[PDB]
Amino acid sequence: FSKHLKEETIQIITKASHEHEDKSPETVLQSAIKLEYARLVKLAQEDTPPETDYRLHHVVVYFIQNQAPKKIIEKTLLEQFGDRNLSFDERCHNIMKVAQAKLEMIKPEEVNLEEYEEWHQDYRKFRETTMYLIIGLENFQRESYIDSLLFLICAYQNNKELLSKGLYRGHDEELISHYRRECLLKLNEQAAELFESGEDREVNNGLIIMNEFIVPFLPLLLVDEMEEKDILAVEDMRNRWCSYLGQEMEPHLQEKLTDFLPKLLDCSMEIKSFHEPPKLPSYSTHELCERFARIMLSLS
Ligand code: NA
């Protein structure tokens, strides 16, 4: 469904046609599927730099690395060669009709439809998780920590869920953990700087950060005693806000602090924030790959 994929599909069909004297669409389609699978296996096998992730380029690379059933990969490839955008060109039109014909013949014994859809839903979630991560890091790099946090929280949770299904399902946990934690710490420091400002408008914004973002999401860093850097980060944030009470405070500011400080100190009763995830924009595969590369090359 892309210029790159449509042209890659036509190119592989033409290369397939040269493999046998018989040029029937049934013969060519079988050779084209074998050639395309081999092309995607090569991508799946490649050791790539951090800015490139061939799982983002094609669902079948994700399926290979995650050891999806062969018949599920085969049906996915048949759907590629049966796509209506192959319908105009003389080289691919009759192959496309043969692929559409074979898709109808597959029996539920060969491909369970719910299993097929589950695999494609995993890949959809992997792409969504990647975009949450991209936007989270793009905002982090711009020092826009509120937008960064909400997207990184979603990337982190999605990713843990994906990786519960298998090792090749998701993204580097250390990377997302680091930026989720650093984002909370930076946003907390921004809140404290505003709280100290002595300008009522800036103080109010610091308090919005604490009441709307830091206190509600603090439990996320406490869910796992094994995540020691997360636990240490929470203690550092709690220490920062208690330190104001080590000397006399102006009474109005003290009241605003102790309005939220008990909930910062013990968030065990409100582990779920019920906050809605931010919405993702629409995106192409090319855009997903380009933006992933760009943020990986811009890490700070
Ligand atoms: Na890579």
Author numbering: 749 to 1048
Question: What do the authors of the reporting publication say about this deposited model?
Answer:
The evolutionarily related deubiquitinating enzymes (DUBs) USP25 and USP28 comprise an identical overall domain architecture but are functionally non-redundant: USP28 stabilizes c-MYC and other nuclear proteins, and USP25 regulates inflammatory TRAF signaling. USP25 and USP28 share an identical domain structure and highly homologous catalytic domains. USP catalytic domains are usually around 350 amino acids (aa) in length; however, in USP25/28, the catalytic domains span ∼550 aa due to a large, conserved insertion of unknown function at a common insertion point between USP boxes 4 and 5 (Ye et al., 2009). Active enzymes form distinctively shaped dimers, with a dimerizing insertion spatially separating independently active catalytic domains.
A C-terminal region comprising ∼340 aa of unknown structure and function, yet with high conservation, is shared by USP25 and USP28. We embarked on structural studies for this domain, excluding a C-terminal peptide in USP25 (aa 1,049–1,055) that facilitates an interaction with tankyrases to mediate their stabilization (Xu et al., 2017). A 1.7-Å crystal structure of USP25 (748–1,048) was solved by ab initio molecular replacement (Bibby et al., 2012) and revealed an α-helical domain without any similarity to previously reported structures in the protein data bank according to DALI. C-terminally extended USP25 (aa 157–1,055) was exclusively tetrameric, indicating that the C-terminal domain does not affect oligomeric behavior per se, as also found for USP28. In full-length enzymes, a C-terminal domain with a previously unknown fold has no impact on oligomerization, but N-terminal regions affect the dimer-tetramer equilibrium in vitro.
